Paper text:
S is the major surface glycoprotein on SARS-CoV-2 and assembles into extended transmembrane anchored trimers (Walls et al., 2020; Wrapp et al., 2020), which give virions their characteristic spiky shape. S1 contains the N-terminal domain (NTD) and receptor-binding domain (RBD). A small 25 amino acid (aa) patch at the tip of the RBD is responsible for interaction with the cellular receptor angiotensin-converting enzyme 2 (ACE2) (Lan et al., 2020). The second region of binding is on or in close proximity to the ACE2 binding surface of the RBD; most potently neutralizing antibodies bind this region and prevent the interaction of S with ACE2 on the host cell, blocking infection (Dejnirattisai et al., 2021a; Yuan et al., 2020a).
Residue numbers in the entry:
A (entry chain H): 1 to 131, 138 to 218
B (entry chain L): 1 to 213
C (entry chain E): 331 to 527
D (entry chain A): 1 to 124
The structure:
């Protein structure tokens, strides 16, 4: 049972602090090279910090003076203290055990850090009314932060569903659409409801989409 | 400071084909300091190859690595559906340094998009904002052009686009373009249209509606 | 009762050098040493002394002088200095923070790189804690990286601690071999046996 | 509290002269060393001249040996690099670097303190 499990990610305003955790099992953080590696939305992997078993620490230039890597030997847990956070620190943060010549063989699942002055807000859900096959959907507008989940007919409708990646609007709020194509013959006989869930704001919206 | 460059940015091949991914170092380095990682969409990276040519545990034989000094190559002898992902090389210098990554996408036959336009709902108009959505459904290749037209005026600077990942079943993409106006601006115009240009279309396709009809 | 030149030739011009994890030490005594000659030797692209100027060494007498020598790759030369961290400084050869000797280094690609690699030059990759200053660890015990004992068998979380450099002529200078000589000066409550000219 | 202040860069024609200066302050003794590194647009940072302060020993790479002179004025704690017979190959950003040791080293990573760098250009 060799695994890594991150936690502690969340939403912080610029200049704030956040502490990440990475609980190990099987391997021991006391005896390994351990890395933090982050990935900004739509970008590549960036190594961030490294701690030797002997205790030496190293940092990328982009985080020097602000981030601090450490560990708790008894709890078998790795930490990353992040101070003076900036918008460009928004990323998924992974911890990994480094074997150097044998590569980083063990990775966690990642924990998401979002740095923004925007306030948590639930989405407005508006119908995309239909007008062989017809297309309909839901517009999930003006929420923050990521993510939202969208299902159709409580999960009974999955075929032909396209839920698009959100776009960050100039207001700092996210917006996305979820669409589905169905036979036009079923518009008058089948209800279509999009089930929107935004857990950060505890928002649950069911929107029936009918022809206009 | 060593620099790692991966090419191409995107590799388009069909399943069953042989893939060759390039990773170049600005300095000639030992092969024991170069590793490869695979990252599928929405998932964490996983070690693929270490020491330039050694497969990590559980990695199938179709993955191989080679290279010496400055030019390193990842070879996939017969792409399987699960192999279409992003691949990163990584060099161990003063610190671990990842290349920019290469995405391996599925090359399929050309598929023209189905285009749909959605006017803003009456519910949204009550809030003072109007969003117009143009949908491009199940097309390939990924390259496409959406031109918003408002009373025949080409609209630029007030729309945003989003593209789904390649579909697991037909390997197509879909795109949504959202035109955002104030309610007061939306009421100043009659004809709203999106004109779609794509390799699968002999001429541009336009979907439109007249506001209030 | 004639005083001879110190055998620095046997250190700097040895046919082969030691691996850094098993670094060699030569105890030098009862001889005259010209340090300025070494200092003005141009191929020594790295010649650094701490708390003392290299041209002052010829005016000083010591009880003994120690010459440590080994091979590392080029981009690790900066770790052979006081206050350094990294795989070499931490796990292979450690200088004390208050070091007051000299560090000498030069490219040895022509001597130590081999077609097909020189895997006989090795370094310690895995170690649980840092070396003390001037500590030499030649253990080859399997390294336990997890909670399960290895019992001398490499496997999951059980790794051989040493790794080969594999020096090749086609590597860049950062990964080419560099020969290093560290001079330490010892002063005891005893007559001095090593002086400068 | 080590600080390195450089000046003296600029544009010159082939064969012209240029003098760089590096005012080093904050050291607690003379057992430090000053080096001039340069970095071409697409190449690596490479040292061209060195001066060990305590013993006042200069060192030069072979490509500048009869063209560059490094020296120190003790009054203003400034190390000067006189560059004569400049060639187009000399075009680069020149950095002053300081190392906490008496002597010389070709590796940039061996120097703990770096100036902001000054641009030197030789016109074709
Ligand atoms: C070491 O030997 C080489 C030839 O192998 C010679 O060129 C060099 O001068 C010698 N160094 C010294 C310090 O005598």
């Amino acid at each position: 049972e060799v695994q890594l499990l991150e936690s502690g990610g969340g939403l912080v305003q610029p200049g704030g602090s956040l502490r990440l955790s990475c609980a190990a099992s099987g391997l021991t953080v006391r005896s390994n090279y351990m890395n933090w590696v982050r990935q900004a939305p739509g970008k590549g992997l960036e190594w961030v910090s490294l701690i030797y078993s002997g205790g030496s620490t190293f940092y990328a230039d982009s985080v020097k003076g602000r981030f601090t890597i450490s560990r708790h030997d008894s709890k078998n847990t790795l930490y990353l203290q992040m101070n003076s956070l900036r918008a460009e620190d928004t990323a998924v943060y992974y911890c990994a055990r480094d074997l150097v010549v044998y590569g980083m063989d063990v990775w966690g699942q990642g924990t998401t850090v979002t740095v923004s002055s925007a306030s948590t807000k639930g989405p407005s859900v508006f119908p995309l009314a239909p007008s062989g096959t017809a297309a309909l959907g839901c517009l999930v507008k003006d929420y923050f932060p990521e993510p939202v989940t969208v299902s159709w007919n409580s999960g009974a409708l999955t075929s032909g569903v396209h839920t698009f990646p959100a776009v960050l609007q100039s207001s700092g709020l996210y917006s996305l659409s979820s669409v589905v194509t169905v036979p036009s013959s079923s518009l008058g006989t089948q209800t279509y409801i999009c089930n929107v869930n935004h857990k950060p704001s505890n928002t649950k919206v069911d929107k029936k989409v009918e022809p206009k | 400071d060593i620099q790692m460059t991966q090419s191409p940015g995107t590799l388009s091949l069909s399943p069953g084909e042989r893939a060759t991914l390039s990773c170049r170092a600005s300095q000639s380095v030992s092969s024991s300091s170069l590793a490869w990682y695979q990252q599928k969409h929405g998932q964490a990276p996983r070690l693929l190859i270490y020491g330039t040519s050694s497969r990590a545990t559980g990695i199938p034989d179709r993955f191989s690595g080679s290279g010496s000094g400055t030019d390193f190559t990842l070879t996939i002898s017969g792409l399987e559906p699960e192999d279409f992902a992003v691949y990163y090389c990584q060099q161990y210098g003063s610190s671990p340094l990842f290349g920019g990554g290469t995405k391996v996408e599925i090359k399929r036959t050309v598929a023209a998009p189905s285009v749909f336009i959605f006017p803003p709902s009456d519910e949204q108009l009550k809030s003072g904002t109007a969003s117009v959505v143009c949908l491009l459904n199940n097309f390939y290749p990924r390259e496409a052009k959406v031109q918003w037209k408002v009373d025949n005026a080409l609209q630029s600077g007030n729309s945003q686009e989003s593209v789904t990942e390649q579909d697991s079943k037909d390997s197509t993409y879909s795109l949504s373009s959202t035109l955002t106006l104030s309610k007061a601006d939306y009421e100043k115009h009659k004809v709203y249209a999106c004109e779609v240009t794509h390799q699968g279309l002999s001429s541009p396709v336009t979907k439109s509606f007249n506001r209030g009809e | 009762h004639h005083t001879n030149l110190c055998p620095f030739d046997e250190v700097f011009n040895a046919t082969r050098f030691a691996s850094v994890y098993a670094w060699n030490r030569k105890r030098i005594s009862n001889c005259v040493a010209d340090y300025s000659v070494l200092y003005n030797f141009a191929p020594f692209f790295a010649f650094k002394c701490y708390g003392v100027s290299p041209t002052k060494l010829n005016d000083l007498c010591f009880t003994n002088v120690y010459a440590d020598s080994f091979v590392i790759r080029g981009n690790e030369v900066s770790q052979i200095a006081p206050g350094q961290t990294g795989n070499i400084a931490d796990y292979n050869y450690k200088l004390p923070d208050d070091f007051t000797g000299c560090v000498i280094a030069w490219n040895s690609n022509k001597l130590d790189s081999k077609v097909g690699g020189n895997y006989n030059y090795r370094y310690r990759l895995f170690r649980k804690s840092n070396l003390k200053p001037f500590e030499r660890d030649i253990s080859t015990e399997i390294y336990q990286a997890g909670n399960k004992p290895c019992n001398g068998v490499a496997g999951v979380n059980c790794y051989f601690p040493l790794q080969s450099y594999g020096f090749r002529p086609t590597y860049g200078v950062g990964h080419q071999p560099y020969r290093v000589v560290v001079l330490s000066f010892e002063l005891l409550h005893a007559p001095a046996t090593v002086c400068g000219k | 509290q080590v600080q390195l202040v450089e000046s003296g860069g600029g544009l010159v024609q082939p064969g012209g002269s240029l003098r760089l200066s590096c005012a080093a302050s904050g050291f607690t003794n003379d057992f430090y060393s000053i080096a001039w590194f340069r970095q071409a647009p697409g190449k690596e940072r490479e040292g061209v001249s060195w001066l060990s302060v305590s013993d006042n020993t200069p060192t030069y790479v072979d490509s500048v040996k009869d063209r560059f002179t490094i020296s120190r004025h003790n009054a203003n704690n400034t190390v000067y690099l006189q560059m004569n017979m400049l060639k187009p190959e000399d075009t680069a950003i020149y950095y002053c670097a300081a190392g906490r040791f008496a002597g010389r080293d070709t590796w940039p990573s061996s120097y703990d303190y770096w100036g902001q760098g000054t641009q030197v250009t030789v016109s074709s």
